[PDB]
Design a protein around this ligand. Structure first.
Ligand SMILES: [Zn+2]
Length: 31
């Protein structure tokens, strides 16, 4: 696990930072 969002009830792992960054945008982006 190079990258991982580590968010509760998600914990999605990634091998590229831009993908994690993009993904994190779903956890810090309600509206
Ligand atoms: Zn996540």
């Amino acid at each position: 696990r190079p990258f991982l969002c580590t968010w509760s009830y998600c914990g999605k792992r990634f091998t590229r930072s831009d993908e994690l960054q993009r993904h994190k945008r779903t956890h810090t982006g309600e509206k």
